[PDB]
Scaffold this motif. Structure first.
Motif, PDB file in Angstrom:
ATOM      1  N   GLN E 131       9.641  10.753  25.835  1.00  0.00           N
ATOM      2  CA  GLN E 131       8.244  10.777  25.415  1.00  0.00           C
ATOM      3  C   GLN E 131       7.348  11.416  26.474  1.00  0.00           C
ATOM      4  OE1 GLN E 131       6.818   6.924  23.606  1.00  0.00           O
ATOM      5  NE2 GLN E 131       8.923   6.240  23.973  1.00  0.00           N
ATOM      6  N   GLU E 134       6.035  11.542  33.444  1.00  0.00           N
ATOM      7  CA  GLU E 134       5.077  10.705  34.127  1.00  0.00           C
ATOM      8  C   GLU E 134       4.449  11.704  35.107  1.00  0.00           C
ATOM      9  OE1 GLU E 134       5.575   6.983  33.350  1.00  0.00           O
ATOM     10  OE2 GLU E 134       3.453   7.466  33.648  1.00  0.00           O
ATOM     11  N   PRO E 135       3.207  11.470  35.537  1.00  0.00           N
ATOM     12  CA  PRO E 135       2.696  12.381  36.565  1.00  0.00           C
ATOM     13  C   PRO E 135       3.586  12.344  37.816  1.00  0.00           C
ATOM     14  CG  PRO E 135       1.287  10.433  36.353  1.00  0.00           C
ATOM     15  CD  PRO E 135       2.198  10.466  35.160  1.00  0.00           C
ATOM     16  N   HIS E 190       0.705  16.400  40.261  1.00  0.00           N
ATOM     17  CA  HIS E 190       0.816  17.161  39.025  1.00  0.00           C
ATOM     18  C   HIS E 190       0.855  16.234  37.823  1.00  0.00           C
ATOM     19  CE1 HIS E 190       3.686  19.566  36.167  1.00  0.00           C
ATOM     20  NE2 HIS E 190       2.426  19.695  35.790  1.00  0.00           N
ATOM     21  N   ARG E 191       0.160  16.604  36.765  1.00  0.00           N
ATOM     22  CA  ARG E 191       0.159  15.805  35.556  1.00  0.00           C
ATOM     23  C   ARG E 191       0.387  16.682  34.329  1.00  0.00           C
ATOM     24  NH1 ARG E 191      -1.980  10.757  35.378  1.00  0.00           N
ATOM     25  NH2 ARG E 191      -1.879   9.762  33.317  1.00  0.00           N
ATOM     26  N   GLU E 193       1.375  17.442  30.422  1.00  0.00           N
ATOM     27  CA  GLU E 193       1.218  16.704  29.176  1.00  0.00           C
ATOM     28  C   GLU E 193       1.326  17.582  27.943  1.00  0.00           C
ATOM     29  OE1 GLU E 193      -2.778  14.956  30.019  1.00  0.00           O
ATOM     30  OE2 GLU E 193      -1.744  13.021  29.936  1.00  0.00           O
ATOM     31  N   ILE E 194       1.986  17.057  26.916  1.00  0.00           N
ATOM     32  CA  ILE E 194       2.095  17.756  25.645  1.00  0.00           C
ATOM     33  C   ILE E 194       1.148  16.975  24.740  1.00  0.00           C
ATOM     34  CG2 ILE E 194       3.535  18.222  23.639  1.00  0.00           C
ATOM     35  CD1 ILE E 194       5.855  18.713  25.438  1.00  0.00           C
ATOM     36  N   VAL E 195       0.100  17.639  24.264  1.00  0.00           N
ATOM     37  CA  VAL E 195      -0.897  16.976  23.434  1.00  0.00           C
ATOM     38  C   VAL E 195      -0.766  17.234  21.940  1.00  0.00           C
ATOM     39  CG1 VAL E 195      -2.522  16.987  25.349  1.00  0.00           C
ATOM     40  CG2 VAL E 195      -2.529  18.868  23.702  1.00  0.00           C
ATOM     41  N   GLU E 205       1.441  22.341  22.260  1.00  0.00           N
ATOM     42  CA  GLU E 205       0.205  22.534  23.001  1.00  0.00           C
ATOM     43  C   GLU E 205       0.427  21.757  24.287  1.00  0.00           C
ATOM     44  OE1 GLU E 205      -3.582  21.517  21.102  1.00  0.00           O
ATOM     45  OE2 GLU E 205      -4.382  21.168  23.118  1.00  0.00           O
ATOM     46  N   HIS E 207      -0.595  20.983  28.416  1.00  0.00           N
ATOM     47  CA  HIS E 207      -1.667  21.010  29.401  1.00  0.00           C
ATOM     48  C   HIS E 207      -1.168  20.539  30.759  1.00  0.00           C
ATOM     49  CE1 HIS E 207      -4.029  21.544  25.840  1.00  0.00           C
ATOM     50  NE2 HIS E 207      -5.183  21.468  26.479  1.00  0.00           N
ATOM     51  N   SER E 209      -2.755  19.548  35.001  1.00  0.00           N
ATOM     52  CA  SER E 209      -3.819  19.437  35.986  1.00  0.00           C
ATOM     53  C   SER E 209      -3.103  19.129  37.297  1.00  0.00           C
ATOM     54  CB  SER E 209      -4.781  18.301  35.626  1.00  0.00           C
ATOM     55  OG  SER E 209      -4.210  17.037  35.922  1.00  0.00           O
TER      56      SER E 209
ATOM     57  N   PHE F 187       3.057   4.432  41.731  1.00  0.00           N
ATOM     58  CA  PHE F 187       3.422   5.023  43.013  1.00  0.00           C
ATOM     59  C   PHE F 187       2.975   4.161  44.169  1.00  0.00           C
ATOM     60  CE2 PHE F 187       4.004   9.142  40.925  1.00  0.00           C
ATOM     61  CZ  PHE F 187       3.065   9.099  39.901  1.00  0.00           C
ATOM     62  N   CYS F 218      -5.406  13.464  39.212  1.00  0.00           N
ATOM     63  CA  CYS F 218      -5.244  14.320  38.049  1.00  0.00           C
ATOM     64  C   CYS F 218      -5.647  13.657  36.744  1.00  0.00           C
ATOM     65  CB  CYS F 218      -3.795  14.797  37.955  1.00  0.00           C
ATOM     66  SG  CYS F 218      -3.265  15.764  39.377  1.00  0.00           S
ATOM     67  N   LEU F 222      -5.047  12.437  27.526  1.00  0.00           N
ATOM     68  CA  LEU F 222      -4.378  11.598  26.538  1.00  0.00           C
ATOM     69  C   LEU F 222      -4.811  10.139  26.652  1.00  0.00           C
ATOM     70  CD1 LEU F 222      -0.728  12.980  26.718  1.00  0.00           C
ATOM     71  CD2 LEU F 222      -2.475  13.490  24.998  1.00  0.00           C
TER      72      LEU F 222
END
Lengths: 225, 225, 225, 225, 225, 225, 225, 225
Positions: E131, E134-135, E190-191, E193-195, E205, E207, E209, F187, F218, F222
């Motif tokens: 799913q 994780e960042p 780093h984060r 994500e699939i939105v 889609e 994204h 950050s 973390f 970040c 979501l």
């Protein structure tokens, strides 16, 4: 019906929204239970699915009826008969059939109508990853004056696995039941085979061997067939 | 699509080896989810079976889509769409359908093909003892890029009993996926009714009301729809 | 039954040759249609399959019966009642249940027996790929003096797909049919939710809201429910 | 396993909310494919339903395996095996089984658990109008490292009809797959028979004969089995 | 580089013998460290494994570099840069990547090559049980005149578990070493994500950050950054 | 646990066949995440290797746990806990640790056992050419009812380099599952520092600051943590 | 496959950002376990790294399988097979491979894809100080229906040292698992050698011998191979 | 060292926080390469994990050194030697070892220290589902004045699978490299076996055969060992 007959087949259907038509010429030996047909995809070819799902729709008059079991199909001529069926695949697909069988002189004529739906696009049938049917055994019994049949079949897959399905059939003689000798419960072994594919997957040489019998491997302690 | 449209329907099929054809003209308010049609059996009628089994084959473009749920059917125009389905009855009967929907301006046209089999002769359907369908709820979800649906329905019988069946459908838009917003899991209520039978049992006035929605009777403790 | 009851549950079963036992304590508001339970896997846990398949076996007395529809379940007290069901998954799995419900004071007691088989090892259940159930709508109708139910349900998969199943249920009141007011055909919305999991996947906080009703989204043109 | 073994059987179940227990004592010839059992309903008898639905639950190790076809069951000893199954009757009844088979010395021990539901009260089973099973043919094939089986069966009815059902089974050896000679697709004929009933309908003398084989009646143009 | 850039991406790879290609169009704000891409699986889709393993190969010029830390990536333009990496999963899977980053006008162009192997067929990746990621936090340090990075990441699983992996990267500027100000040791959050997922799981889609920094939560006792 | 505690440490180990023992007296502020220790090499010193490889083995109860994240370590008191870990250095060296933590009133007591092997003799560690650890970020997640951790660390090297290693840890609370609130994925930043070395390189004043948190730099488009 | 075959090889890859392509022609005696090849660097030569790292990627169908151990590779023809692998070097370098093997007449064709990274610039590979591989022993065992292999290899360095690495491979037959005789755990010795280098380091004459076997030097006390 | 020596073993360790001690007595034939030991768990037994993980820690002076390969271990006596190692299992477990070997008269004495961690609780080791080791082949080579070794081993699991691990060892003679004849690169076959288990699984009769050699199955074209 004679020992040797020619076969003429016309087929039309729509599976997963794909329209197609087939036509075939062949020969059969009614009392030997052997049939051969060169089936051609006249429209909608090459089919976007395995031809295997169409094979079982192409034979019940060409079967060797043994042990004195009354032959519901050969008794129906010259009038002939029709049969209806729905095949339920284990992965959610359904294929329903309506067929008419008549004898024109010495040629058996099959007229088939088919509607199939919900075949998974990634399944073995739609991905054309099947490799023919394993032989099968149909259970036949009377009900409401007509002859019924149920069959479990298994399609060989490229993976080595088998894709199973369930056929539920009703055979209808065009002759008044009264004019027929209804059979007792019995079985019918069937071995469908495609021995040749050509013309870019639009022409198939198909064969069939079938025998109607009683359970002959397991003796009855009660004296039943 | 217009909020006021007419309907033209063409239907052909064979159930238990009985061939027949129907045609109808009607009106519908796509956004209101209401429709009415006068269906005439133009061939093979009066039918030897209850017309009820044919009713559910006659409208998914005519549905009130609420709660911002994307409407897969209205998004499909002008291209249109098709759907395929098999209905399984608890008494062993099967009825498979192939349907094409197209919009000629302000008129929706329905082309339907049907094959039915194994209906019990002394059953309520073949005996014409059914008295219309109870309302129903259809489950709708995406799969393989198209829209699927499953419904449980119940036919009212003189007995006071109900004859249940299971509908498994696949709706296929003719529009490019790129131009279609797929909906999340949702439901659609449907109330199919024959409000009048005339012309010696060959003309049926059918009405339909349907609403697509989420589950609004049971609160979600997780904040989901 | 009171408007506030305590709940005690005992469950034992075997799925794909894996024996397990569960026990839970909870509470519910019979007339509000809400219930909650803290179910613990007392034996055989963590389960080698998704707990989701067990949830729906855990409460028909806790449902808000609206529109004056006779409540077959609440009517059954003090005697109590039992119910039996078989859930058929689309990928070949079967799960059969036998349940007994008793009301001792203001504590509802559930005794559940389960036998499940043929769950594919790489399917969403055995691989634990599910994310709970979507709400559902049960169809209820009487037959032969007892109350029947059929429901289609759908399990959410990480993949975005849904694994569907069919529930076929028979509810049996311990009161005689003569001492009960049998209900007409109606529906029951259900929204099962697991809001918390702990103790290495052996303790589940389960909630549910249910409502019995007629179809009111679609107006009848004949005055029917 | 030897040419002659003792058979002890223990069974418990609940069908249509009726709890019962059975125990049996008999003998079998593993390589001859013949079994003899004296089954007694120890609790809950005479049963409110036909004993016929219980028969098929009482022995896959006692089958004459022919044609070099590897015998999955005999290869599992001494560790043994278990099998699970769901039987779907055409009139809506379901019966799910879980069984363990062990070889204690020269005695095969069967431990059976059963849960059945939805049998119609006026049907031939609950009305005790069935008169034994017809012989049958099981389809066997491997999948996911275990052995699968599917069978269609027909119960003879006093009114001349046959009540049909579909068995879906998974056989699980207790040996590691790498220690077993996995079998190709094949069939198994089965002929169950009750030769005697006594003790107020609580003691049944049951016998069975079974043979594992390939299709032997149909010639193959490709030379396939 | 501009404050707003367009993104074009080309990807081709083979994972567990399954070949595929992807293409994406996007936008990003280099100094804000945010970017978005619509990735399409142009060949080999839907993929037989989770798209999650591809996401991280799709950003290192689009990161908010803080605290005066020299930016190895933005300093590389117009020459651009490439980076190589191997991701080691805890369950034995390996995925190696080679990437080229070019600046064409206002468009950052990404050319990616991937080879994956040894992913367990029943693992969360091949079974699509994940799913999203994780960042994460990447450790960055220079070695042999180039910039190195190492990252620990974790894929969320449906059952609450996490599947972890280890990324080992070498970033290679195309700019002359004499023209670059090398950075001291630092981190980058780093984060990914699939939105949104559509078009039968072939369009995503995505994204991201990210922020480059020193350790700011734990004060140094020796005055170090 | 008190907001201000004393610390007593005992350590024994063997690295590259060299046996040694250490003991320390220190203090810390558990909720502030700060700690200090005066570590003395009591046997086998001065060590033939860098003391830096020992530092990370000397404090998880002393960490500022923010964002309401459950604190697995402070929750463990009064029972206490232990942890096991293996550190893998990039140049082939391995160091495994077993530690017990107990809270004796207001004094935390650490018992540590170590075994290290394969450190290259000309490497920075055996040559004593290291200049302290860079801060690090540990990834924490639950599995099998316990808390796992993975960290990547970078030891400052001679010629401006960094020697990297990977820590894989399992933390084990002495409390039972029912008495703990397990944390989600999070973390932990850590900053180890040696601010003073004395007594012929056998006495080290060691400090550390740590903070448990989610990724706060970040943004999440979501709503995740 | 014949006892004497022709070999045709195609290779392409990128290592440390350096693209290259190779092609080769050769011969092999599949059952003798020997093969020779003249490998040409057609693009990107002379390679900025030792050709030794490419050697192991150039033929598992050419091995002498002794002791009756089933030959997974030769059984795969005519369908052929593919294999995937990742080689991990002790100094941090990684090299991943994807290969397809097909047989056209008596010509074995190899198609190889490669991606390598993190090779230290001053390491023996990038400096071209390696002098070929020492012979090796591969461990082979089945898992999830396919054949796996793991090998430890060691490159001889000019300074008397050895650079070691670890190979992890998954071999995938193109035949269905059920149509193959899977082997038991076993080993394979391999002796790769470059016997000639010409054309300025762009043409290499490569030879190899390999034998599959059980442990033949250490007798079993338990009677195992 | 004589050709017949007595063996005494003392072991202490902690694996997954479980402390234990073992003691063994046996015999060895240094030049025949065979030894046997009766190993007793004297503390913490029966162990909560498979004894198989301890077996490989119990023999390198007992190996038949063939082909004139200098024997690093025998040359070390009377002084003796020590060795250190870390075993990396594929499912994430690590086990590190420190051993001392001395020759007391005609009795070899082994002193073993062990620390193991992260063994998965549901893996075959903690579940006691392993069934002994498969033979193996260790790679041996000198480096920095000592002898290094690496071996890949495979544990046989009950289900038929294999659990693999990687051993990294450094052997340290107590004699100066000056008085030793260092060996060239070579191999050592090893076959560990447990031939008896008794005393409630706390006593194990362990045996082993080992031979040091060069690759003898593959002839060298160039002329190397």
């Amino acid at each position: 019906i004679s020992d040797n007959v020619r076969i003429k087949l016309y087929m039309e259907g729509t599976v997963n929204n794909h329209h197609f038509m087939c036509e075939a010429e062949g020969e059969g030996k009614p009392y030997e239970g052997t049939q051969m047909e060169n089936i051609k995809v006249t429209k909608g070819g090459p089919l976007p699915f395995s031809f295997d799902i169409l094979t079982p729709n192409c034979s019940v008059a060409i079967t060797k009826y043994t042990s004195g079991i009354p032959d519901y199909f050969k008794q129906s001529f010259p009038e002939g008969f029709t049969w209806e069926r729905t095949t339920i695949y284990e992965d959610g697909a359904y294929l329903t059939t309506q067929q008419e069988t008549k004898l024109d002189g010495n040629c058996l004529v099959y007229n088939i109508k088919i509607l199939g739906c919900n075949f998974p696009p990634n399944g073995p049938v739609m991905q054309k990853k099947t490799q023919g049917w394993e032989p099968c055994c149909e259970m036949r019994y009377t009900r409401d004056g007509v002859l019924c049949g149920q069959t479990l079949m298994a399609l060989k897959c490229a993976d080595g696995n088998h894709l199973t399905c369930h056929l539920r059939t009703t055979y209808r003689s065009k002759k008044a039941a009264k004019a027929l000798q209804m059979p007792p419960f019995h079985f019918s072994d069937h071995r469908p085979e495609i021995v040749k594919v050509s013309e870019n997957g639009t022409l198939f040489e198909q064969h069939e061997s079938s025998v109607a019998r009683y359970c002959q491997t397991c003796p009855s302690k009660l004296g039943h067939n």
